[model samples]
Target: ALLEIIHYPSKILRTISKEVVSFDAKLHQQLDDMYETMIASEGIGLAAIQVGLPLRMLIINLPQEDGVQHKEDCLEIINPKFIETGGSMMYKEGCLSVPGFYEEVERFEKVKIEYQNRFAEVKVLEASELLAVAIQHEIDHLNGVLFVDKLSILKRKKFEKEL
Candidate 1:
């Protein structure tokens, strides 16, 4: 089943996510739907809040060098925590919650995150480049922050006025 994606300005998108304590079948089902919804929306990553569920879970499927996002590459993240981060880089970012909006945002270039799978199995990943950026972006959503909030005052004002 495809879940509905919440758009920007929705109150749900601003709600802080809660940690997932139940690694039951229900959680697994939600993760499955999230993956389907993300791919359907042509998104590389999706936060739980994006689908109106404020749970500390997300899914990311990065495109390979050939520009393809494969299902087997999907990372089902739950209760993610940043273990380490280094460097900095500016990358153009967009959000499913803010459709048609894209902007350059400053983010860490590398990160090591400790996250749980849908079944509560802990895993760690050291990611760089776009993967690092995507992880930070999704984690921000879990904290009730959007990428647009990272914009400069001038840029934010422009976006606000336009919206």
Candidate 2:
């Protein structure tokens, strides 16, 4: 089933998502739905609250690239937090929840994060480039932060008054 991606200017997007506990079949089902929903929306990343759940869950659908696929192909982050961040880069980023808007968002070029997998196992990941920016964007969604909270371009001005 495809979960609806909640748009911005909605309360759930601004409400901090909570840590998920009791990892079980229900969790598995929701994780599967998240992947389906993310794919259907043509988005590389999604957070649980974007689907109307205030849970600290997010998924990143990364494509296989040279020198990357050999590593574990993890998907959803059960409860994630940054372990470390290095360097900086500005990338034009978009969000499923925000829809149709893109912004040059400043983000760490490299990031290390500690998060739980769907099975409740802890994992650490180091990522850069698209993966880096995508993780940063989704993590922000987990924290009630939106990309527009960081900008107001002419195209983004309509969102200005909402901030």
Candidate 3:
């Protein structure tokens, strides 16, 4: 079953997540629930705090291309960290935690990430484009950064007008 996602403007959404210290049954179970919630919301990524769990965990599911299903590309990063980033690109971004909001944001065109994968395996990955942006966005959630925080004052005012 999918879990309820906490919306933005909540105190937890502004707090950085604590690192996961152990890979035990409870951690695994929460990861499973996060994955289910993300897919159910049709979101490409989700952070632990989005579901009111303040842990360094996130999941991502990239869009399919070239007739290939990339389900296995799903990531379960525990205590994830951004090791390096390069280049820059702008993409319109949104968040499940921030409903009815969308804005263009600049992000690294490429990045190298280090984290512990499911099964407690350490993995390093290099990604670009949407994958890069998605991971960075989710990781920012771990650090209490939201996409709206990157918007200009004008944009923020416009957002407020629409609401």
Winner on TM-score (2 vs 3): 3
Regions of model 2 farther than 4 Å from truth: 65-74, 152-163
Which candidate, 1 or 3, would have the higher TM-score against the true structure? 1
- What's the TM-score of each model vs. the native? 0.95, 0.88, 0.93
For candidate 1, give the lDDT. Answer: 0.92
**Which residue pairs collide in model 1, if any?**
none
**Per-candidate total of colliding backbone pairs:** 0, 0, 0
Candidate 1 structure, TM-score to reference: 0.95
RMSD of 2: 3.4
Residue-wise lDDT of candidate 3 within 22-111, one digit each (tens)?
898888899889988887888889999999998998998876876443668788888888899899888899999988888888899999
Q: Which candidate's TM-score is highest?
A: 1
lDDT value, residue 63 of candidate 3: 69
Per-residue CA lDDT of candidate 2, range 87-123, in tens? Answer: 9888998888877777787899999999999889999
lDDT values of the candidates? 0.92, 0.84, 0.87
- The residue-by-residue lDDT of candidate 1 on 26-49, one tens digit each, is 988899999889888999999998
